[PDB]
Amino acid sequence: MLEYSELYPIQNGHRMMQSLDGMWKFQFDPEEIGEKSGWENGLPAPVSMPVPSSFADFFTDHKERDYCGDFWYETEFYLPAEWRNKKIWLRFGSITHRGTVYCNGMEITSHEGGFLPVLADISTVAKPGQVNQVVVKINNELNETSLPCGATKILNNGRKLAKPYFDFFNYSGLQRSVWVIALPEESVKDYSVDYELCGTDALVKYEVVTTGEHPVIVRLLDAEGELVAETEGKEGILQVANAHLWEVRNAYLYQIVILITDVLDEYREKIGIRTVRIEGTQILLNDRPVYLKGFGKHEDFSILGRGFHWGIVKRDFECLKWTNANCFRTSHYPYAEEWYQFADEEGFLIIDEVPAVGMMRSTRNFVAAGSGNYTYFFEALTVPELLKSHIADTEEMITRDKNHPSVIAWSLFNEPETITDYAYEYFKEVFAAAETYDFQSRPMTGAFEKNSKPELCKCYPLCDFICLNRYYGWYISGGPEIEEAEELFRDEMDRWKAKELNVPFVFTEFGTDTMAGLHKLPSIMWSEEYQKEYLEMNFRVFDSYEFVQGELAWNFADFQTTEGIMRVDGNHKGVFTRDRQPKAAAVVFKDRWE
Template sequence: MLKPRSTATRELVNLDGLWRFAVDTAVGEHPWTGPLDTPLEAAVPASYNDLFTDSAIRDHVGRVWYQRSVRVPRGWAGERVLLRLDAATHEGKVYVDDTLVAEHVGGYTPFEADITEHVAAGQEFRLTIGVSNELTNTTVPPGTITVTADGRRQQKYHHDFYNYAGLARSVWLCSVPNAHIEDITVVTGLDSTTGTVEYEVATSAPVPVRVRVLDALGTEVAAAEGASGALRIDDVTPWRPGAAYLYDLVAEIVDGGEVRDTYAQPFGVRTVEVRGTQFLINGEPFYFTGFGKHEDTPVRGKGHDNAYLVHDFQLMEWAGANSFRTTHYPYAEEVLDFADRHGIVVIDETAAVGINLAVEGGLTGRPHKPTYSKDTLNDDTRAAHAQAIRELVARDKNHPSVVMWCVANEPSTHEEGAREYFEPLVELTRKLDPTRPVCSTASLLTTHQNDRIADLFDVVCLNRYYGWYIATGDLATAEALMESELHAWAGKLGKPILMTEYGADTQPGLHSVWDAPWSEEYQVAYLEANHRAFDRCEAVVGEHVWNFADFQTSPGIHRVDGNKKGVFTRDRRPKSAAHALRARWSCLNGRKPANNA
């Protein structure tokens, strides 16, 4: 599915703005059959949870409804009219007037409907979208719904971030020709100073296709006929971390010498490879510095915001970060487009977080249900997980910034059934894209001794909190534990190790002359202890601090106004740790630090 673009043959109308809004308990059984009877309006894109002062809306479990009128441009007669949602978290139903035109499960990937037969050029229609935030044992991410004694529905989940919901990304009305380009796949390689470009163009009907490659100045550097083939770019300029360079692959449907449809797909020429304990980009060793992040801002929740996008990337550049992981779901496409243009490396992750019922045992000390079973996470869960992988790869396959697929965050991989659950998913990911490495992150409960699936992946990705959840306040012990585990993993698998999470909750403005957890000084000392351990293990290829910025979580006594592990506050003010990271990372420039043994 191509991202909507305005071209010589395509037009689009952005439908963002204020929509009529209601929760399902406040409207009739079929609210799409007429004007939505509500005094409320909600912003799109934005999560709805923090927009209103009514806690019943914030805590609502079930479906909410958005509605607005849309006029089809009068010049679209004879064109196909598409309706595109960049996301509906976590499940969406779309109605044009009284007709259901689309349904989609999965909260962070796009879907669309051809509504040509239901609308007319120059005329208005009523657009109604129902969005459900419900999570069950067969959704990704999973969750459970309980009902209190007084009849209130409550959502429970195992991931440590707030379950924001709604239309957090843009909605579009698009026109395309009757015979049109539906998808483009670009795979690149490097042969000395020559770039290789394999391409495939999918069309709505068998039609003649030609392609041209344009450089950044718009000069044609290669061309071919046919819907699939291979091209060569002489004296190629590769896409590099910190030095982005993009080409356009312009695909055209040509009929009788006339261009019937055209679409330009940006791409970068680069290679990714794991060799021994090295992670290579364009054949050169790369050392990750950066963060796990969240799409999380005040009021907007997970709503995409271009101002925050620009500022966050500026802060990452200031800190010396060269990369980030899309924790714990696919981010808005605008984020990856920006990373492509600015040379930031991305590990792209599915929404498979919370696949770990063992966490219940770890937090409570009580026995827990098995993670993988007929009654918990089962074949239906894995099918939803597989679909999430398909949609992630289909959406993001052409982004040069994306160098690795992460199929899950902190799943319970030491339990019985883990390999049977994950092996088919890893095989699917490699089949969909054999050009990128595949990984999953390991939680504290997964060790080199009890893990069942790490051999399936190309990179060992560890989430570790020695000095915070383990050996709290004892950084000498924490450093020794970290170094010991790193060498154990390296000795077992001989693969690159990426520290995908390590961090300490920190209250901004709290200071201490001692190693006092929650103080800004402790966060700095904690990071330094971890870094010394990383630097003494040759297999470590990078460090992603948890987290870039403080973020909102579900209510609970162990979180006061959210997770405070950010090195920036939720409104993006630096803590002392941000300055410490800048001092370390600004000198590295993608290279492995010197050994501190």
């Protein structure tokens, strides 16, 4: 279990917080001489770099956009003098992909994983009342011992080029907000809630972790601040009579309030009373079935790359609502915590995905996810280091996101090898670990490439429901062969039906690249009309199987990828353009999903 708290920062009497967002100093370190040359003390010749954002798309030259290797940030903040006697942490929403944090010259901690928060305890070096310095050494290379997976090519000048095993640009930097926070010396470290429904009434079971021994009181407030339940102890049950349940696209948020007393700490968070259970082939939310309708997405916008902005969230949610979606998948990595906060208010359902993408050794991975070629990926001697990373990223993800009502499943892989017992052994461990970290035991899943065929795949028995990525009519029998493609699709769904697994299937990826404004009569692959015809055919197949309980189309919006001959300025399978405007097919979803 973890040496820090994953809880979002708040500001009350006992807990303080100050934003470090703004313009930082930035400098590339291509010869990797920073540590030995005093950069922990300040950067020798930096530039200005916005935070949060991704560094790549600001520059005007290739070597800098495509930089791969070591690079540094530095900034300076004044701590209020009133934060003596408090524990003081730096909280980075993310450090992509790995980094060591230095503060006032001292190395505080290093982290691996570029999509989950990083906590640095600077209590012993922070100078309250004075100006303080923070310096972060970051690395954005890809390998097969960390997620997401890939490789690093050295070119003739010795400069490094990222060669990912995934299909999305390797944005990196400090992409999410950065805080400095003050906690009490005895503090709430973690807590977990589970829900039971008793007719109209409800139980909120909870457990609490603290950095101390003092008694804990837990209060639960309704939307208007009035009290509805109170229990003493670090373990308890809250009784909410005539409970107001969090519903799909109709949220109700209670407020939990955790206290440590003699009052030493207070933590407050919005939660939603709802239950998630798989009965047979159905997904039950509050004991009634739900059908998932929505999109795979990316944290991706012009200029900012993966940088968080609230304006992107607002628009992306006003578009999801306009299509009448109810659900999205945080593909292929946990998002910024603000996305889940807002999903909670709006009643969207989230499949939360750990970044286990790239577990097949292929640099053009999307044509290759149906080629039939096994890459011997889980037979290699780096696999134990990889497994340790994957489990640690699952643990940090679940701890961070488990108390959001919108999060209803965990996706623990996208398009890996599953056709050999080497991969069963691997994934069995991962699921085992995820089952222990989630106090609610909500459904665990992953998304399968076409190569994980019903006859050969070893891993679908680990899944509570099964997610399929399928491109019938695009990478398989596309264009004039599109009727062959429908058959082949039905052929496979027939074989899955024949297995009588009695579990739900969700299509988590299907789509066509579509250039906005390419019209052709008759339609051709890449036009707007072909996208509509494609979707109308996948819909017919989905609607032919009682156990298909969900469609998450790929993608919500055009996004940026590694450049290559099959990628025309990124990936054009969006239903919206990258500036968040709808292609002709968005209307297809809107109508179907009403």
